[PDB]
Write an enzyme that holds these catalytic residues in place. Structure first.
Site, PDB file in Angstrom:
ATOM      1  CG  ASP A   1      -4.981 -47.594 -29.609  1.00 29.16           C
ATOM      2  OD1 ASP A   1      -3.985 -48.363 -29.551  1.00 29.16           O
ATOM      3  OD2 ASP A   1      -5.085 -46.576 -28.936  1.00 29.16           O
TER       4      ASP A   1
ATOM      5  CG  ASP B   1       0.014 -50.813 -23.169  1.00 29.86           C
ATOM      6  OD1 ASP B   1      -0.099 -49.768 -23.828  1.00 29.86           O
ATOM      7  OD2 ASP B   1      -0.903 -51.317 -22.487  1.00 29.86           O
TER       8      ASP B   1
ATOM      9  CD  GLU C   1      -0.756 -52.171 -16.519  1.00 30.03           C
ATOM     10  OE1 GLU C   1      -0.719 -52.770 -17.627  1.00 30.03           O
ATOM     11  OE2 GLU C   1      -1.658 -51.386 -16.170  1.00 30.03           O
TER      12      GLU C   1
ATOM     13  CG  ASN D   1      -2.694 -50.887 -26.258  1.00 29.38           C
ATOM     14  OD1 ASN D   1      -1.797 -50.049 -26.148  1.00 29.38           O
ATOM     15  ND2 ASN D   1      -2.897 -51.791 -25.320  1.00 29.38           N
TER      16      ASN D   1
ATOM     17  CG  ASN E   1      -0.667 -46.787 -25.114  1.00 31.08           C
ATOM     18  OD1 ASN E   1      -0.193 -47.047 -26.210  1.00 31.08           O
ATOM     19  ND2 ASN E   1      -1.977 -46.714 -24.905  1.00 31.08           N
TER      20      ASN E   1
ATOM     21  CB  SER F   1      -0.883 -47.594 -29.135  1.00 33.56           C
ATOM     22  OG  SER F   1      -1.837 -48.084 -28.194  1.00 33.56           O
TER      23      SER F   1
ATOM     24  CG  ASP G   1      -1.330 -36.477 -18.524  1.00 30.47           C
ATOM     25  OD1 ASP G   1      -0.708 -35.541 -19.059  1.00 30.47           O
ATOM     26  OD2 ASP G   1      -2.313 -37.026 -19.052  1.00 30.47           O
TER      27      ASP G   1
END
Ligand code: NA
EC number: 3.2.1.17
Length: 129
Positions: free
Chosen positions: A48, A52, A35, A46, A59, A50, A101
Protein backbone atom coordinates in the site's frame (compact mmCIF):
# COMPACT_ATOMS: atom_id res chain seq x y z
CA UNK A 1 20.86 -3.10 17.45
CA UNK A 2 20.27 -6.87 17.19
CA UNK A 3 18.96 -7.92 20.63
CA UNK A 4 19.48 -11.33 22.14
CA UNK A 5 16.24 -13.20 23.04
CA UNK A 6 16.57 -12.89 26.90
CA UNK A 7 18.06 -9.33 26.47
CA UNK A 8 14.90 -8.20 24.59
CA UNK A 9 12.64 -10.00 27.15
CA UNK A 10 14.45 -8.00 29.92
CA UNK A 11 14.09 -4.67 27.98
CA UNK A 12 10.35 -5.33 27.32
CA UNK A 13 9.69 -6.29 30.99
CA UNK A 14 11.48 -3.15 32.24
CA UNK A 15 9.25 -0.94 29.98
CA UNK A 16 6.12 -2.72 31.36
CA UNK A 17 5.17 -4.90 28.34
CA UNK A 18 4.98 -8.24 30.29
CA UNK A 19 1.26 -9.06 30.69
CA UNK A 20 0.26 -5.70 29.10
CA UNK A 21 -3.41 -6.06 28.00
CA UNK A 22 -3.03 -9.69 29.24
CA UNK A 23 -0.23 -10.60 26.79
CA UNK A 24 2.60 -12.61 28.50
CA UNK A 25 6.22 -11.63 27.77
CA UNK A 26 6.67 -14.66 25.43
CA UNK A 27 3.90 -13.28 23.14
CA UNK A 28 5.88 -9.99 22.76
CA UNK A 29 9.30 -11.75 22.26
CA UNK A 30 7.70 -14.16 19.71
CA UNK A 31 6.16 -11.17 17.85
CA UNK A 32 9.51 -9.36 17.79
CA UNK A 33 11.29 -12.56 16.54
CA UNK A 34 9.05 -12.91 13.45
CA UNK A 35 8.48 -9.17 12.82
CA UNK A 36 12.18 -8.02 12.95
CA UNK A 37 14.40 -11.01 14.01
CA UNK A 38 15.04 -8.75 17.05
CA UNK A 39 16.69 -6.04 14.86
CA UNK A 40 15.76 -2.46 15.96
CA UNK A 41 16.73 -1.11 12.47
CA UNK A 42 14.31 -3.42 10.47
CA UNK A 43 12.20 -1.57 7.84
CA UNK A 44 9.86 -3.20 5.26
CA UNK A 45 7.65 -1.56 2.63
CA UNK A 46 3.96 -2.62 2.44
CA UNK A 47 2.17 -3.08 -0.98
CA UNK A 48 0.00 0.00 0.00
CA UNK A 49 3.17 2.20 0.13
CA UNK A 50 3.24 2.44 3.99
CA UNK A 51 6.37 1.15 5.79
CA UNK A 52 6.76 -0.97 8.95
CA UNK A 53 9.54 0.14 11.35
CA UNK A 54 11.57 -1.39 14.19
CA UNK A 55 11.55 -4.45 16.55
CA UNK A 56 7.72 -4.58 16.28
CA UNK A 57 7.28 -3.44 12.59
CA UNK A 58 4.93 -0.52 13.50
CA UNK A 59 3.16 0.72 10.37
CA UNK A 60 3.28 4.33 9.06
CA UNK A 61 -0.35 3.81 7.75
CA UNK A 62 -1.60 4.62 11.36
CA UNK A 63 1.01 4.94 14.10
CA UNK A 64 4.09 7.05 13.08
CA UNK A 65 5.02 9.79 10.60
CA UNK A 66 7.49 8.99 7.80
CA UNK A 67 6.33 11.84 5.47
CA UNK A 68 5.77 9.41 2.51
CA UNK A 69 2.49 7.62 3.44
CA UNK A 70 -0.35 9.65 1.82
CA UNK A 71 -3.61 9.69 3.81
CA UNK A 72 -1.97 8.12 6.87
CA UNK A 73 -2.20 9.07 10.56
CA UNK A 74 0.51 9.37 13.29
CA UNK A 75 -1.46 8.13 16.32
CA UNK A 76 1.75 7.52 18.39
CA UNK A 77 2.86 11.17 17.65
CA UNK A 78 6.43 10.11 16.71
CA UNK A 79 8.60 10.15 13.61
CA UNK A 80 8.85 6.53 12.33
CA UNK A 81 12.69 6.83 12.61
CA UNK A 82 12.27 6.99 16.46
CA UNK A 83 11.11 3.34 16.16
CA UNK A 84 14.61 2.31 14.83
CA UNK A 85 16.49 3.37 18.01
CA UNK A 86 18.58 0.85 20.01
CA UNK A 87 16.42 2.06 22.99
CA UNK A 88 13.00 0.38 22.60
CA UNK A 89 11.08 3.02 24.71
CA UNK A 90 9.32 4.55 21.64
CA UNK A 91 8.43 1.14 20.11
CA UNK A 92 7.06 -0.14 23.46
CA UNK A 93 5.04 3.08 24.14
CA UNK A 94 3.53 2.87 20.59
CA UNK A 95 2.93 -0.94 20.85
CA UNK A 96 0.91 -0.30 24.05
CA UNK A 97 -1.38 2.01 22.00
CA UNK A 98 -1.67 -0.56 19.13
CA UNK A 99 -2.57 -3.63 21.31
CA UNK A 100 -5.14 -1.37 23.14
CA UNK A 101 -6.91 -0.50 19.77
CA UNK A 102 -9.49 -3.38 19.98
CA UNK A 103 -7.99 -6.48 18.26
CA UNK A 104 -5.20 -7.06 20.80
CA UNK A 105 -2.05 -8.57 19.27
CA UNK A 106 -4.00 -9.62 16.10
CA UNK A 107 -2.73 -6.17 14.88
CA UNK A 108 0.57 -8.01 14.25
CA UNK A 109 -0.34 -10.44 11.41
CA UNK A 110 2.96 -12.41 12.12
CA UNK A 111 1.84 -12.77 15.80
CA UNK A 112 -1.54 -14.16 14.61
CA UNK A 113 0.04 -16.47 12.00
CA UNK A 114 3.18 -17.68 13.90
CA UNK A 115 2.75 -17.03 17.70
CA UNK A 116 -0.94 -17.03 18.64
CA UNK A 117 -1.86 -20.32 20.45
CA UNK A 118 1.76 -21.64 20.39
CA UNK A 119 3.92 -22.38 23.46
CA UNK A 120 5.11 -18.71 23.63
CA UNK A 121 6.69 -19.30 27.09
CA UNK A 122 9.52 -21.13 25.15
CA UNK A 123 10.58 -17.62 24.03
CA UNK A 124 11.55 -16.57 27.64
CA UNK A 125 12.69 -20.13 28.69
CA UNK A 126 16.00 -19.90 30.67
CA UNK A 127 15.92 -16.02 30.82
CA UNK A 128 16.87 -14.42 34.16
CA UNK A 129 13.81 -12.10 34.49
NA1 NA B 1 1.73 8.02 8.96
Amino acid sequence: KVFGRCELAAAMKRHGLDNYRGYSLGNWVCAAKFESNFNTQATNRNTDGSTDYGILQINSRWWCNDGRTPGSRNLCNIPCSALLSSDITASVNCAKKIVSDGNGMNAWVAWRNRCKGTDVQAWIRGCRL
